[PDB]
Amino acid sequence: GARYVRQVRESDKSRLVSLLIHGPAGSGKTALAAEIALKSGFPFIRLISPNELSGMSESAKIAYIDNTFRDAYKSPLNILVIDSLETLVDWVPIGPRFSNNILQMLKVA
Amino acid sequence: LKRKPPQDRRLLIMTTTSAYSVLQQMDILSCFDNEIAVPNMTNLDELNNVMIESNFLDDAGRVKVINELSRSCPNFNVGIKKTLTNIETARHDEDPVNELVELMTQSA
Numbered sequence A: 001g002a003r004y005v006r007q008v009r010e011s012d013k014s015r016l017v018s019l020l021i022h023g024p025a026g027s028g029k030t031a032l033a034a035e036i037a038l039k040s041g042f043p044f045i046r047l048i049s050p051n052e053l054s055g056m057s058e059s060a061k062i063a064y065i066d067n068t069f070r071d072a073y074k075s076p077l078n079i080l081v082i083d084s085l086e087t088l089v090d091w092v093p094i095g096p097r098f099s100n101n102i103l104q105m106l107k108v109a
Numbered sequence B: 001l002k003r004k005p006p007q008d009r010r011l012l013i014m015t016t017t018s019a020y021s022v023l024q025q026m027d028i029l030s031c032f033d034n035e036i037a038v039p040n041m042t043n044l045d046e047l048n049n050v051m052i053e054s055n056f057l058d059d060a061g062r063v064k065v066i067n068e069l070s071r072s073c074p075n076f077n078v079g080i081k082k083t084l085t086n087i088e089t090a091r092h093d094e095d096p097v098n099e100l101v102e103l104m105t106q107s108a
């Protein structure tokens, strides 16, 4: 994580770096991501979590996501933590059921 | 069910269910920190204890019904709710052992 942070800091052509942190349930992924982000020491850091979106409607959620991603296009250095991707799209394996709108929005974001 | 209370508050949640398999299929069994189990009645002495507590046996009835169901039913498994309902409905007509025996045999 520290190496990736340094690389994004220094390189002048790599203007977008994305990571995936996958593993078995209960393994402690969010703690590690938060630790890396904190120790990085960047001016601008944000986090998107399921807790913040509870009770809202689909349009409100999309609006919130778009606003948060737009707030990050200022300043010359930024960090964003997206938590538990699969529960942001309301996944359940019986159908399977999920939300195509939010998924497509994230895929384009 | 996985949100911590603000500041320094505390919370205990107890949720019941009867469709464990469905919850397993929905993949929602990771929100719980432990799992208690409640089994059925599986013995005659337990039925006797329920009877003494419900004021129905009158001693002789206890003996007659227990003796009848000892050989009239090899396997016995019923919940408390249905047992209490069966006792109550048996009380009205033919307080003798017969009615309870039929009710218990058919219910099990």
Ligand SMILES: Nc1ncnc2c1ncn2[C@@H]1O[C@H](COP(=O)(O)OP(=O)(O)OP(=O)(O)O)[C@@H](O)[C@H]1O
Pocket: A024, A025, A026, A027, A028, A029, A030, A031, A032
């Ligand atoms: N590398 C680590 N070393 C020590 N403790 C850790 C580590 N990573 C996580 N933890 C501990 O794990 C707990 C939090 O777990 P965490 O939410 O990160 O788990 P998770 O598997 O990502 O969660 P979820 O089940 O919601 O997907 C805290 O007690 C935290 O200290």
